[PDB]
């Protein structure tokens, strides 16, 4: 029995929709600190981790800790039924039913049955990342959109005071370059020259849903996976892990 209040149901819907693109079912862990989630897609190529401490929530009330599982499609639809200025309320009783209510111009409550999902706890230890680049969401979104025009793979090339993402097809080529002096790049910290490539399908699936003005930091190495980060209202965070190519 908990009472969770969230202002701006649209942002919550966007976050859950972004999370649900890769996966189908997940279990939400709720404790006295916040809500955390983690899962891996059926293709074993992407791992998504999400947390939401109590600081962001307008009102939080939880006793103990429990894991709540539910289908992503139905939850996504119910959240999409929300508006821009409403306040989302997640509440539940002893009965194992998830009751979602949106309180704006009028109060509407939906019932979403629960589901049990096996939990496979896996943590990938932090690896030696030879580059850390912080860029806006718009630049990466547009770069991915262009790269998808010529080929189905994308390439990153980090260098001292230099970052550039490329893409090559059978005949055509695409290249995007930026520097620290530019306004699209904030900070770059490279230890040595780096080169890697990632599929355009997964990059497009995960990038879609980032505001034009946002902060995104990418950690990648030489022929090793990539990590993407960005904060949710300055307290929570979202973690993406993508396996490399070749």
């Amino acid at each position: 029995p908990f009472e969770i209040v969230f202002e701006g149901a649209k942002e919550f819907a966007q976050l859950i929709e972004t999370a649900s693109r890769l996966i189908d079912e997940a279990a939400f862990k709720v404790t006295e600190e916040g809500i955390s989630m983690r899962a891996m897609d059926p293709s074993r190529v992407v791992l998504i981790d999400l947390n939401l401490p109590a600081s962001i929530f307008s009102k939080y009330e939880v006793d103990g800790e429990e894991t709540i599982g539910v289908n992503m499609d139905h939850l996504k639809k119910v959240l999409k039924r929300g508006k821009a200025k409403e306040t989302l309320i997640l509440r539940k009783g002893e009965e194992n039913f998830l009751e979602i209510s949106l309180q704006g111009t009028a109060t509407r409550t939906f019932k979403l049955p629960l589901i049990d999902v096996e939990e496979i706890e896996v943590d990938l230890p932090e690896l030696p990342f030879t580059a850390k680049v912080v860029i806006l969401g718009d630049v990466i979104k547009e770069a991915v959109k262009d790269a998808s025009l010529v080929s189905d793979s994308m390439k990153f090339i980090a260098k001292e005071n230099e970052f550039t993402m490329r893409a090559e097809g059978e005949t055509q080529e695409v290249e995007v370059k930026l520097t620290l002096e530019d306004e699209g790049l904030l900070d770059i910290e490279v230890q040595e020259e780096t080169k890697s490539a990632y599929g355009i399908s997964y990059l497009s699936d995960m990038v879609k849903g980032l505001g034009k003005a946002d902060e995104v930091t990418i950690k990648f190495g030489n022929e090793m996976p990539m990590q993407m980060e960005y904060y949710i209202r300055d307290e929570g965070r979202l973690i993406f892990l993508l396996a490399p190519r070749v």
Partner: peptide, 8 residues
């Protein structure tokens, strides 16, 4: 043979 479009 490289495919001549981005989503072949």
């Amino acid at each position: 043979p490289k495919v001549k479009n981005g989503s072949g």
